[PDB]
Amino acid sequence: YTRVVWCAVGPEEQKKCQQWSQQSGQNVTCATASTTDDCIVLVLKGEADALNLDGGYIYTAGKCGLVPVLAENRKSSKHSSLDCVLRPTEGYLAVAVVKKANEGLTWNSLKDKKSCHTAVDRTAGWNIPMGLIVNQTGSCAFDEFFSQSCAPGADPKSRLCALCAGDDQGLDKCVPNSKEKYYGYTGAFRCLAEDVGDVAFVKNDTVWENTNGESTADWAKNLKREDFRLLCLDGTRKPVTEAQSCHLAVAPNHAVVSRSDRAAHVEQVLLHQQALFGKNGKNCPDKFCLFKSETKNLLFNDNTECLAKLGGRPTYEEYLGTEYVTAIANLKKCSLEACAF
Ligand SMILES: *[C@@H]1O[C@H](CO)[C@@H](O[C@@H]2O[C@H](CO)[C@@H](O)[C@H](O)[C@H]2NC(C)=O)[C@H](O)[C@H]1NC(C)=O
């Protein structure tokens, strides 16, 4: 009843969800699926209530009637006077990242290079970059633009999965969940950091969080920011300290979605759940912290300060903005109004 069923994507989020379920006293329980799409379906069926989603998936989900309930909010130097739950969200910066030692690689010389994407249909990992590339090349053959890629969720036999690695055993190659080594903001940057690919489409935060000692994960230990460069749209290259003037787009924050008829309930539970396991929650550090997963961004991004109320009770289009919705719409016409399932 006042119990919420969260949808976890893959084995690792399932384990974090079970831990959460346990500390919550069954106030939250877990459903598990192998992909975000599957989790969206469980929610439509009513077999699950909510899950946190990147903007690209919010678009899929909105067409099927799901609604944004609360958004992820990270720290700001602005609006700091206002409490986290009521502070407007800022949006994140979608950037293209390369290794400095790879001299001469710019936005205009990306053809036939190797790329790393968070996952097919995601904001920074796919929608924005591929949207710009289709626009620029006057072509829908984005499957022929890079020689090889790791783009979780595409055909495993195809070149968009050639660079993906699967799990500890080589199983699950290219699955759009964390079992795939190079999945998500972290996997895509690792794909670049190990030199598997030449470019990685992630957000600004990912570079700062995985360099200069911020990570301790074996592959990130020795990563220095000065060994990285962002590709700007003007053909230029800049240090990662200049993302405000060298980004592909500003993107809406990841947000929690639910079916419209369960929204008020999910919202109420979440606010109480974060009072308990959020940033300064009563039980967070001591027992369990919703927003940590040792750099793996499980269920929520690890840099989340809190989940924030929306205000303006936005529909999913109002939430994503007309800009981003037209970019996705135009990109989708390369692969007609209905719920994808
Ligand atoms: C599960 O949710 C219920 C409901 O919010 C919590 O029980 C409430 O407990 C508070 C304070 O402990 C009481 O003041 C309220 O009257 C109760 N609310 C309801 C609707 O019963 C309970 O503490 C939560 N359990 C956990 C572990 O999160």
Ligand SMILES: *[C@@H]1O[C@H](CO)[C@@H](O[C@@H]2O[C@H](CO)[C@@H](O)[C@H](O)[C@H]2NC(C)=O)[C@H](O)[C@H]1NC(C)=O
């Ligand atoms: C790709 O090109 C399309 C078409 O020009 C861009 O989509 C349009 O978006 C702009 C706003 O940015 C509107 O002024 C146009 O009228 C829109 N057109 C259509 C047909 O929808 C799209 O934004 C570009 N994609 C990216 C990622 O920049």
Ligand SMILES: *[C@@H]1O[C@H](CO)[C@@H](O[C@@H]2O[C@H](CO)[C@@H](O)[C@H](O)[C@H]2NC(C)=O)[C@H](O)[C@H]1NC(C)=O
């Ligand atoms: C790019 O993202 C980083 C976060 O990954 C932003 O820097 C953080 O800024 C806050 C203050 O608002 C600090 O408390 C953190 O310590 C910073 N993080 C790190 C790891 O350095 C940065 O300002 C963002 N820039 C743009 C242009 O959006």
Ligand SMILES: O=c1ccc2ccccc2o1
């Ligand atoms: O997608 C968005 C997100 C926030 C916002 C605020 C004011 C006006 C339009 C907006 O669109």
Ligand SMILES: [Fe+3]
């Ligand atoms: Fe995202």
Ligand SMILES: [Zn+2]
């Ligand atoms: Zn901009």
Ligand SMILES: [Zn+2]
């Ligand atoms: Zn509105």
